[PDB]
Design a protein around this ligand. Structure first.
Ligand code: HEM
Ligand code: HEM
Ligand code: HEM
Ligand code: HEM
Lengths: 141, 146, 141, 146
């Protein structure tokens, strides 16, 4: 469960991301594709070259979904319901992959927010991304 | 892989009693029922809405026999799993786009099916040898991914 | 989430286990220690030899907690809150290990209950053990 | 560890800029804060109840320096990680009883720390190289477990 302090830390850190969300989402994806190539199996229909428009576009979508979750941090299962259905019933991405994207998002935030990525904040963001992953995987079976 | 002679021979003797057609059908079928997201690769097989439909599906059954047949032929190459499954690894990656985590899930389902079939004969040490085999096969199947 | 059919399936299977719960618990542990030797790091104080009495006694406790969970299948967090605290604050077993014991318990059940271990019951039992695992690691951080 | 020479030069290039003493205390400290169950091995280290207690604890900082010193030394032996880390693998298994999953968690935290310190210089390709390195070290440290 997220604690009051976790929620504060996540809103603060995401607040600083601001209007960079999209860019950071695309970077998180590129990091994932290169560090964990098996994740590429879910995107056979994308051009995955550096700077690809499909990657930027998808980055923004992911980032917007995370922004929505932060905006609704006290009601995430309902805020992400539609996405939860989509992953469970259509996309059917193996659960292990969520841990990989989460880690790459943390690396990306660390690379861009040196003053805000303290140990406490790192801890809260990791818990937050784990909670998002849980919600997204909750209807799989 | 790092298989002890008593382990190598525990695998081999058990495998000689296996009906590949039945076990194959059962392993793949159970994979699809227990971990429903693995159905994503098999939309053209037909109806998979219920366990009964999955287990009775002839395409599921025939695909299971094919998969386990290749697994079976690999048990004769334990000292070289990588070279034996190399072209299969490439196909799974480049043509089929199958997340290798699926190979791990099937392995564990396979181990459960062997236990279901052989009961008392599938002792703790026999299981440990098969766990090494199934992880070795999984790793060989994922080796050419890029 | 456990559906009505899952609970029924889990109650029936566990019902046949009956007075063998303790023996199966011990057998599942032995299979785990042998198949996944890294799990032995949590029991440096046990004699882990075949038939040692610590494994037996511990197999009984594990099996009884599972029986209690099956009986409280609709109220798990509450029924297992004490074990949840114990694992989170004292034992501190890494979450990955729960998957390993769960697999070994399923193998144990398939071994001893061939007629009852149908594909649908296999599905329910794996979901049930996953939920139990989730409950036991819910207070870790 | 299969590393391209260009991956190996990126890894070495960056590592040349690291203050191992400071990065060692940060990585160990963050492991114990983010994944608090790992504190089970450090009960003699005193107060680990809040983030500042952990991050500034002189024993955590000294232990971090020791861990990262040994890790550095491994970066000079990328073609023989298993041999380099054999006695430490044994020690972690037989004396300290450390679940090897802890080595994987530390690797991931180390990657976050490198990213935190180097910012943009820690590009996606450089990360990818470091991920192969931390997995290889974790694997080497686990290799003598039994
Ligand atoms: C932080 C966790 C994640 C979130 C928030 C997220 C969110 C999203 C969003 C917003 C979409 C777009 C759906 C739409 O068009 O409305 C999407 C699609 C998709 N996601 Fe997820 N996702 C996550 C993790 C992953 C993972 C780990 C993978 C697999 C590696 C994955 C694979 C996909 C694929 C293949 C699509 C379809 C892309 C396309 O065809 O355009 N997602 N996701
Ligand atoms: C023991 C591990 C496995 C082995 C040994 C194996 C082997 C094979 C073989 C020999 C083929 C025939 C390819 C050809 O016609 O040349 C094949 C096809 C295929 N396999 Fe596997 N396989 C394994 C696991 C899996 C799993 C776990 C999945 C997904 C859940 C999967 C998905 C597929 C698919 C989608 C095909 C193509 C079927 C078609 O043509 O419609 N495989 N496999
Ligand atoms: C199915 C999930 C599990 C359940 C239901 C469970 C249940 C229990 C129970 C009932 C106890 C005894 C507490 C007491 O004595 O009153 C216990 C203790 C313990 N468990 Fe868990 N456990 C599970 C998984 C694991 C895993 C995966 C590990 C690590 C591999 C583990 C390690 C331990 C250890 C080391 C103890 C202390 C044993 C002793 O010193 O006597 N458990 N568990
Ligand atoms: C990169 C991975 C690691 C390396 C290279 C490493 C290296 C070392 C070294 C050089 C020592 C001192 C050996 C001695 O006292 O003779 C040590 C001790 C120790 N390590 Fe590891 N270590 C690693 C990861 C970890 C992890 C992740 C943990 C647990 C979370 C851990 C737990 C310990 C403990 C408890 C000691 C003994 C502390 C004491 O003196 O009381 N290590 N390690």
């Amino acid at each position: 469960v997220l604690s009051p302090a976790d929620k504060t830390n996540v809103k603060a850190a995401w607040g600083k991301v601001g209007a960079h969300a999209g860019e950071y989402g695309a970077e998180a994806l590129e990091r994932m594709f290169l560090s964990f190539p098996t994740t590429k199996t879910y995107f056979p229909h994308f051009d995955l070259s550096h700077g690809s428009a499909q990657v930027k576009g998808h980055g923004k979508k992911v980032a917007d979904a995370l922004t929505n979750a932060v905006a609704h941090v006290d009601d995430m299962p309902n805020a992400l319901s539609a996405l939860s259905d989509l992953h469970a019933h259509k996309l059917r991405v193996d659960p292990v992959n969520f841990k990989l994207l989460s880690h790459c998002l943390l690396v990306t935030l660390a690379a861009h927010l040196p003053a805000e990525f303290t140990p406490a904040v790192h801890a809260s963001l990791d818990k937050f991304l784990a909670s998002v992953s849980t919600v997204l995987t909750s209807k799989y079976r | 892989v790092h298989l002890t002679p008593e382990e190598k021979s525990a695998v081999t003797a058990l495998w000689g009693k296996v009906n590949v057609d039945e076990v194959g059908g059962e392993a793949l079928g159970r994979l699809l029922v227990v971990y429903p997201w693995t159905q994503r690769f098999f939309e053209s097989f037909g109806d998979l809405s219920t366990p009964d439909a999955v287990m009775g599906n002839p395409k599921v059954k025939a695909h299971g026999k094919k998969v386990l047949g290749a697994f079976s032929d690999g048990l004769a190459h334990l000292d070289n799993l990588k070279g034996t499954f190399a072209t299969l690894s490439e196909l799974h990656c480049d043509k089929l786009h199958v997340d290798p985590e699926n190979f791990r899930l099937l392995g564990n389902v396979l181990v459960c099916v062997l236990a279901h079939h052989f009961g008392k004969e599938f002792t703790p040490p026999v299981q440990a040898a098969y766990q090494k085999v199934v992880a070795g096969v999984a790793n060989a199947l994922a080796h050419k991914y890029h």
